[PDB]
């Protein structure tokens with residue numbers, strides 16, 4: 001169900017690193033679209049740092065008049081959720097859009113990945 | 122459910138600006154595929170004007186023998202609907218096609234966005 | 243439901259022009275991926291001829307060792323079905339693939355369109 | 364349902380060639396993204412060899428520090444399942460991703476196909 005995805009967004013968006021991390025199965029992975037290949041894999045014990053570093057990135061974006069807006073997850077059965085994301089300037093300009101994929105197993109996240117429109121570095 | 126999406130198409134297609142606007146949550150956004158970026162964001166109080174201006178555009182299209190045809194929304198659970206759109210000439214020629222995304226929250230539209238085949242200016 | 247889509251494939255695949263045509267609403271359209279634009283629109287009374295001409299095309303393909311294989315439609319609620327198509331040579335070579343979109347209204351087809359991988363003329 | 368897809372992954376991943384093969388209808392096809400065209404068709408009696416040869420390929424990949432990870436299938440009704448695949452290096456680098464399509468009929472696989480991001484030879 002969507003509860004673990006909701007919990008993840010709320011806790012990770014406030015810096016409750018420990019709650020956010022615990023949304024992931026011990027074998028779960030969070031794939032970010034950076035690095036040599038199509039992405040970089042983060043395991044559960046890499047994910048707390050990742051959250052912290054993405055929060056710091058978000059603050060720089062905000063200071064520039066840009067921020068991401070995440071919609072409530074759309075569930076496809078119990079084990080998959082799609083989250084629409086839109087990155088917008090305060091002037092009303094979409095600068096990026098994408099979909100966060102969540103694959104769940106047993107109420108935990110086993111895969112978080114993103115598909116984005118603009119391949120930002 | 123699809124009722125608010127249906128209400129939106131019927132009212133906005135006839136110029137009932139006030140009913141159409143009220144289909145959107147106060148925090149909702151309607152993204153149009155124009156502007157510097159991947160689109161331009163319209164908030165609820167920008168949406169009435171937008172409807173009026175798109176109706177005027179539609180009349181110019183019709184006078185040229187071109188018009189858009191929208192299918193009934195296909196629901197994915199309660200909170201997402203997809204609307205197929207086809208732009209056709211009176212001679213039977215598809216000139217554009219796309220999908221209108223609706224994300225709902227609490228019976229209101231929180232995101233209307235479009236994906237189109239031809240990136241028309 | 244899928245019955246009208248199944249009926250359409252069975253009847254149109256055997257040349258029962260009248261049954262196939264009657265699967266379409268009077269306002270339905272069948273879009274083929276040929277012509278000046280992204281496709282060409284066929285109304286209900288253009289569709290019988292279209293079926294005949296596509297059957298004749300299919301026979302030429304078969305004589306060349308190529309044929310299309312259609313899977314059973316995958317339903318998304320009552321009013322949308324997706325049909326996977328694969329075009330294969332008798333030597334085991336996929337030469338095209340795509341998805342037939344069916345949008346239904348009231349048990350009739352209101353839109354049949356195709357998305358294909360190879361933009362064959 | 365997903366049972367036949369699960370059975371197929373478990374048995375084919377261990378070399379139980381006979382169980383894996385019997386997951387396919389007698390008319391089923393497994394399409395691999397190699398060959399002259401958009402893929403190559405394997406019938407039921409070609410599929411055992413295919414499994415063996417893909418296992419041997421997998422062992423070479425593993426010896427290079429690369430392996431594929433398959434998620435549990437996401438069902439769309441009874442007759443379609445999507446399986447997310449990610450190919451990763453042991454250093455945490457996604458090198459390929461895709462989706463395995465399964466179309467079922469009567470509890471058997473009638474079509475297995477893949478869509479991949481990187482068109483690897």
Ligand SMILES: CCC[C@H]1C(=O)CC(=O)O[C@@H]1CC(=O)/C(C)=C/C[C@@H]1O[C@@](C)(CCO)C[C@@H]1C
Nearest residue numbers: 009012013032054055058068085097098114116
């Ligand atoms: C993992 C890739 C990140 C990108 C996507 O996933 C979709 C996209 O294109 O934009 C994203 C970047 C973005 O704009 C924001 C606001 C990231 C913030 C983070 O958001 C949380 C809630 C986790 C989800 O990322 C905690 C952080 C504050």
Ligand SMILES: CCC[C@H]1C(=O)CC(=O)O[C@@H]1CC(=O)/C(C)=C/C[C@@H]1O[C@@](C)(CCO)C[C@@H]1C
Nearest residue numbers: 130133134153175176179189206218219235237
């Ligand atoms: C917001 C982008 C507009 C495009 C799409 O969304 C999908 C696409 O490619 O074509 C569209 C343009 C089009 O052809 C029409 C008929 C617009 C009319 C408007 O339609 C209403 C019902 C609202 C929905 O747009 C009120 C207006 C009369």
Ligand SMILES: CCC[C@H]1C(=O)CC(=O)O[C@@H]1CC(=O)/C(C)=C/C[C@@H]1O[C@@](C)(CCO)C[C@@H]1C
Nearest residue numbers: 251254255274296297300310327339340356358
């Ligand atoms: C309308 C576009 C046609 C293409 C698609 O729709 C998907 C695709 O890429 O290949 C198709 C062409 C094809 O290979 C066949 C076998 C057409 C035969 C016709 O099939 C029937 C059953 C109607 C459905 O087309 C009656 C005809 C004998």
Ligand SMILES: CCC[C@H]1C(=O)CC(=O)O[C@@H]1CC(=O)/C(C)=C/C[C@@H]1O[C@@](C)(CCO)C[C@@H]1C
Nearest residue numbers: 372375376395417418421431448460461477479
């Ligand atoms: C049929 C195309 C193969 C590719 C995909 O399907 C998705 C993708 O991009 O990567 C795949 C290649 C891959 O990395 C692995 C691990 C193949 C192993 C095989 O996996 C089993 C379980 C069958 C499913 O393939 C038995 C074999 C050991």
